[PDB]
mmCIF file of C-alpha atoms in Angstrom:
data_model
loop_
_atom_site.group_PDB
_atom_site.id
_atom_site.type_symbol
_atom_site.label_atom_id
_atom_site.label_comp_id
_atom_site.label_asym_id
_atom_site.label_seq_id
_atom_site.Cartn_x
_atom_site.Cartn_y
_atom_site.Cartn_z
ATOM 1 C CA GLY A 1 3.443 -5.160 17.411
ATOM 2 C CA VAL A 2 4.672 -7.078 14.247
ATOM 3 C CA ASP A 3 6.056 -10.611 14.379
ATOM 4 C CA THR A 4 10.297 -9.358 12.070
ATOM 5 C CA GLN A 5 10.052 -13.189 11.245
ATOM 6 C CA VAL A 6 7.163 -13.644 9.003
ATOM 7 C CA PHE A 7 7.260 -9.306 7.795
ATOM 8 C CA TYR A 8 10.802 -8.924 6.434
ATOM 9 C CA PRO A 9 12.586 -7.488 3.377
ATOM 10 C CA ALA A 10 13.005 -9.578 0.944
ATOM 11 C CA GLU A 11 16.544 -9.557 -1.186
ATOM 12 C CA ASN A 12 15.813 -7.998 -3.973
ATOM 13 C CA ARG A 13 12.163 -6.688 -4.153
ATOM 14 C CA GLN A 14 12.171 -6.130 -8.333
ATOM 15 C CA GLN A 15 13.120 -9.802 -8.722
ATOM 16 C CA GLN A 16 9.532 -10.542 -5.495
ATOM 17 C CA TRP A 17 7.675 -7.645 -8.143
ATOM 18 C CA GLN A 18 8.356 -9.954 -11.247
ATOM 19 C CA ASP A 19 7.742 -13.121 -10.035
ATOM 20 C CA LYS A 20 3.714 -12.423 -9.332
ATOM 21 C CA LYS A 21 3.099 -11.959 -12.961
ATOM 22 C CA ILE A 22 1.330 -8.408 -13.152
ATOM 23 C CA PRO A 23 2.517 -6.112 -15.160
ATOM 24 C CA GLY A 24 4.805 -3.170 -14.287
ATOM 25 C CA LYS A 25 8.432 -2.848 -12.590
ATOM 26 C CA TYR A 26 7.250 -1.021 -9.274
ATOM 27 C CA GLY A 27 4.205 -1.659 -6.869
ATOM 28 C CA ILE A 28 1.710 0.423 -4.801
ATOM 29 C CA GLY A 29 -0.418 -1.648 -2.508
ATOM 30 C CA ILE A 30 -3.607 -1.399 0.043
ATOM 31 C CA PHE A 31 -4.959 -4.032 2.181
ATOM 32 C CA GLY A 32 -6.853 -5.051 3.736
ATOM 33 C CA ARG A 33 -11.323 -5.543 3.079
ATOM 34 C CA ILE A 34 -12.299 -3.305 -0.231
ATOM 35 C CA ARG A 35 -15.364 -1.045 1.971
ATOM 36 C CA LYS A 36 -15.630 2.056 1.418
ATOM 37 C CA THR A 37 -14.114 2.993 4.891
ATOM 38 C CA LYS A 38 -11.118 1.735 4.674
ATOM 39 C CA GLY A 39 -10.815 3.526 1.580
ATOM 40 C CA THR A 40 -10.231 1.976 -0.879
ATOM 41 C CA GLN A 41 -12.254 5.034 -2.761
ATOM 42 C CA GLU A 42 -9.624 7.268 -2.377
ATOM 43 C CA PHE A 43 -6.740 4.869 -2.889
ATOM 44 C CA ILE A 44 -7.880 4.230 -6.458
ATOM 45 C CA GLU A 45 -8.711 7.315 -7.545
ATOM 46 C CA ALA A 46 -5.166 8.329 -6.282
ATOM 47 C CA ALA A 47 -3.824 6.196 -8.774
ATOM 48 C CA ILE A 48 -5.792 7.401 -11.750
ATOM 49 C CA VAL A 49 -4.126 9.854 -10.833
ATOM 50 C CA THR A 50 -0.787 9.221 -10.015
ATOM 51 C CA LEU A 51 -0.445 6.348 -12.156
ATOM 52 C CA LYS A 52 -1.065 8.362 -16.272
ATOM 53 C CA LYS A 53 2.179 9.468 -14.818
ATOM 54 C CA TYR A 54 4.289 7.052 -13.783
ATOM 55 C CA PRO A 55 4.035 4.285 -16.992
ATOM 56 C CA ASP A 56 6.601 1.751 -15.210
ATOM 57 C CA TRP A 57 4.345 1.314 -11.778
ATOM 58 C CA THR A 58 1.598 -0.626 -10.838
ATOM 59 C CA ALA A 59 -1.037 0.020 -7.711
ATOM 60 C CA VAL A 60 -3.006 -3.423 -6.261
ATOM 61 C CA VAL A 61 -6.101 -3.805 -4.134
ATOM 62 C CA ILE A 62 -4.799 -6.976 -2.154
ATOM 63 C CA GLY A 63 -8.633 -8.463 -1.164
ATOM 64 C CA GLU A 64 -12.299 -8.308 -0.904
ATOM 65 C CA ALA A 65 -15.536 -7.219 -0.728
ATOM 66 C CA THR A 66 -18.397 -8.737 1.184
ATOM 67 C CA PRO A 67 -21.380 -9.782 -0.184
ATOM 68 C CA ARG A 68 -22.560 -6.098 0.887
ATOM 69 C CA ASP A 69 -19.928 -3.489 -0.993
ATOM 70 C CA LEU A 70 -19.386 -5.934 -4.355
ATOM 71 C CA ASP A 71 -21.267 -2.981 -6.097
ATOM 72 C CA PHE A 72 -18.991 -0.318 -5.250
ATOM 73 C CA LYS A 73 -15.995 -3.224 -6.187
ATOM 74 C CA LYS A 74 -17.270 -2.405 -9.500
ATOM 75 C CA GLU A 75 -17.973 1.085 -9.364
ATOM 76 C CA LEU A 76 -14.284 1.404 -8.214
ATOM 77 C CA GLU A 77 -13.035 -1.269 -11.504
ATOM 78 C CA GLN A 78 -15.138 1.100 -13.742
ATOM 79 C CA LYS A 79 -13.549 4.198 -12.328
ATOM 80 C CA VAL A 80 -10.126 2.230 -13.618
ATOM 81 C CA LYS A 81 -11.518 1.084 -16.534
ATOM 82 C CA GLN A 82 -12.918 4.396 -18.299
ATOM 83 C CA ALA A 83 -9.977 5.718 -17.261
ATOM 84 C CA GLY A 84 -7.339 4.018 -19.371
ATOM 85 C CA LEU A 85 -6.158 2.507 -16.738
ATOM 86 C CA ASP A 86 -5.923 -1.550 -16.271
ATOM 87 C CA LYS A 87 -2.872 -2.203 -16.450
ATOM 88 C CA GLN A 88 -1.761 -0.209 -14.444
ATOM 89 C CA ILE A 89 -4.808 -1.169 -11.171
ATOM 90 C CA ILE A 90 -5.360 -4.615 -10.578
ATOM 91 C CA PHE A 91 -7.826 -6.432 -7.872
ATOM 92 C CA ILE A 92 -5.959 -9.260 -7.152
ATOM 93 C CA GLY A 93 -7.906 -12.567 -5.829
ATOM 94 C CA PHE A 94 -8.051 -13.717 -2.396
ATOM 95 C CA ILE A 95 -6.237 -16.667 -2.156
ATOM 96 C CA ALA A 96 -5.796 -18.637 1.605
ATOM 97 C CA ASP A 97 -2.197 -19.563 1.535
ATOM 98 C CA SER A 98 -0.294 -18.005 4.786
ATOM 99 C CA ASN A 99 2.342 -16.233 3.404
ATOM 100 C CA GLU A 100 0.958 -15.420 0.245
ATOM 101 C CA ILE A 101 0.290 -11.603 2.121
ATOM 102 C CA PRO A 102 3.665 -11.280 4.166
ATOM 103 C CA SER A 103 5.032 -11.914 0.127
ATOM 104 C CA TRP A 104 3.345 -9.153 -0.581
ATOM 105 C CA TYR A 105 4.265 -7.042 1.057
ATOM 106 C CA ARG A 106 8.095 -8.204 -0.012
ATOM 107 C CA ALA A 107 7.706 -7.542 -3.508
ATOM 108 C CA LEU A 108 5.826 -4.017 -3.000
ATOM 109 C CA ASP A 109 7.954 -0.135 -2.958
ATOM 110 C CA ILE A 110 4.505 1.594 -1.503
ATOM 111 C CA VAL A 111 2.168 1.043 0.809
ATOM 112 C CA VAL A 112 -0.927 3.190 1.642
ATOM 113 C CA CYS A 113 -3.480 2.737 4.917
ATOM 114 C CA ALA A 114 -6.097 4.751 4.213
ATOM 115 C CA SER A 115 -8.579 4.146 6.605
ATOM 116 C CA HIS A 116 -10.763 6.144 7.826
ATOM 117 C CA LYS A 117 -11.596 5.479 11.610
ATOM 118 C CA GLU A 118 -11.075 1.777 11.199
ATOM 119 C CA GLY A 119 -6.770 0.377 11.870
ATOM 120 C CA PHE A 120 -4.336 -0.920 14.720
ATOM 121 C CA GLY A 121 -2.220 0.238 11.934
ATOM 122 C CA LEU A 122 -0.910 -3.584 11.740
ATOM 123 C CA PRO A 123 -0.508 -3.004 8.119
ATOM 124 C CA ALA A 124 1.762 -0.187 8.506
ATOM 125 C CA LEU A 125 3.170 -2.033 10.686
ATOM 126 C CA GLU A 126 4.184 -4.958 8.464
ATOM 127 C CA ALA A 127 4.530 -2.662 5.800
ATOM 128 C CA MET A 128 7.070 -1.253 8.025
ATOM 129 C CA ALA A 129 8.754 -4.737 8.832
ATOM 130 C CA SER A 130 9.501 -5.103 5.316
ATOM 131 C CA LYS A 131 10.741 -1.506 4.062
ATOM 132 C CA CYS A 132 7.617 -0.709 1.792
ATOM 133 C CA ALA A 133 7.921 2.801 2.012
ATOM 134 C CA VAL A 134 3.510 3.976 3.831
ATOM 135 C CA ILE A 135 1.416 6.143 3.482
ATOM 136 C CA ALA A 136 -1.201 6.799 5.926
ATOM 137 C CA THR A 137 -4.371 8.072 7.924
ATOM 138 C CA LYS A 138 -4.746 8.469 11.337
ATOM 139 C CA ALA A 139 -6.223 5.429 11.330
ATOM 140 C CA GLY A 140 -3.705 4.116 9.184
ATOM 141 C CA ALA A 141 -0.620 4.757 11.006
ATOM 142 C CA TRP A 142 -2.794 4.115 14.842
ATOM 143 C CA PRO A 143 -1.800 5.461 17.399
ATOM 144 C CA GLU A 144 0.932 8.246 16.297
ATOM 145 C CA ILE A 145 3.405 5.566 14.667
ATOM 146 C CA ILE A 146 4.670 7.944 11.008
ATOM 147 C CA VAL A 147 6.282 11.252 11.720
ATOM 148 C CA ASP A 148 5.548 12.864 8.520
ATOM 149 C CA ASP A 149 8.409 12.942 6.294
ATOM 150 C CA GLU A 150 10.673 10.810 8.254
ATOM 151 C CA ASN A 151 9.543 7.599 8.335
ATOM 152 C CA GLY A 152 6.502 7.190 5.875
ATOM 153 C CA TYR A 153 4.097 9.738 4.857
ATOM 154 C CA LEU A 154 0.283 10.906 6.563
ATOM 155 C CA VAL A 155 -2.622 12.266 5.223
ATOM 156 C CA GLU A 156 -6.140 13.017 6.167
ATOM 157 C CA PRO A 157 -9.521 10.557 5.597
ATOM 158 C CA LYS A 158 -11.487 11.411 2.303
ATOM 159 C CA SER A 159 -8.649 12.588 0.480
ATOM 160 C CA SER A 160 -7.476 10.947 -2.471
ATOM 161 C CA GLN A 161 -5.715 14.639 -4.025
ATOM 162 C CA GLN A 162 -3.558 14.180 -0.724
ATOM 163 C CA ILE A 163 -2.290 9.863 -1.383
ATOM 164 C CA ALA A 164 -1.334 11.173 -5.284
ATOM 165 C CA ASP A 165 0.662 14.007 -4.401
ATOM 166 C CA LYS A 166 3.014 11.161 -1.625
ATOM 167 C CA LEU A 167 2.547 8.497 -4.241
ATOM 168 C CA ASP A 168 4.222 10.970 -7.433
ATOM 169 C CA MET A 169 6.722 12.495 -4.193
ATOM 170 C CA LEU A 170 8.153 9.194 -3.688
ATOM 171 C CA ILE A 171 8.151 7.916 -6.923
ATOM 172 C CA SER A 172 9.863 10.440 -8.010
ATOM 173 C CA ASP A 173 12.566 10.692 -5.654
ATOM 174 C CA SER A 174 13.628 7.435 -4.942
ATOM 175 C CA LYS A 175 16.874 8.696 -2.592
ATOM 176 C CA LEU A 176 13.596 9.853 -0.418
ATOM 177 C CA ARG A 177 11.876 6.778 -0.746
ATOM 178 C CA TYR A 178 14.371 4.582 0.620
ATOM 179 C CA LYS A 179 15.100 6.632 3.152
ATOM 180 C CA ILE A 180 11.883 7.340 4.690
ATOM 181 C CA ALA A 181 11.182 3.317 4.236
ATOM 182 C CA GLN A 182 14.620 2.652 6.144
ATOM 183 C CA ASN A 183 13.190 4.735 8.693
ATOM 184 C CA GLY A 184 9.980 3.386 8.351
ATOM 185 C CA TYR A 185 12.012 -0.291 9.387
ATOM 186 C CA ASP A 186 14.490 0.478 11.709
ATOM 187 C CA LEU A 187 10.891 2.425 13.970
ATOM 188 C CA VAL A 188 9.428 -1.214 13.424
ATOM 189 C CA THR A 189 11.965 -3.409 14.605
ATOM 190 C CA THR A 190 12.827 -2.076 17.355
ATOM 191 C CA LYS A 191 10.358 -0.741 18.842
ATOM 192 C CA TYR A 192 7.026 -2.957 17.785
ATOM 193 C CA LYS A 193 8.857 -5.860 17.118
ATOM 194 C CA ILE A 194 7.345 -8.870 18.822
ATOM 195 C CA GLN A 195 10.592 -11.167 20.190
#
């Protein structure tokens, strides 16, 4: 379950995003360690396809690469630069503070949970508790938290284009995005609330 006293929606998402002082008007995020098994590459590749189409949207990677994966993070940064998207795909720096993370969920419209295998679904639950629309793999939303097209989306692991297709759809139909997000929120505050 998730602590809904910690993870919850802001009063004004557009303002929470503005307060981060990063380019764009609407955000998409991925949380956790930067490592290939976490799906960070499918996220970046999906963002490169998607964000060429939507200039007001920005993707953020919230987490860091451990030493063994610094090379991987550099390759991702290169892919972004070579696509001409360094104003729309941003790797956020580490901060120790307890609420940075919950505050990020409050600033984001969409969260992607792209893990190939690892996870207990907590970042899907945290995102849903914050009324973010979630796109996840089976691992990302373990164990079967999401009903596709009802309270989030499901994608196969290792498929950047499937993530892009879902991002495209959620960005282009805001009414659908808000309904999906609300449905996810309703589910987690009812069935996965710690208190």
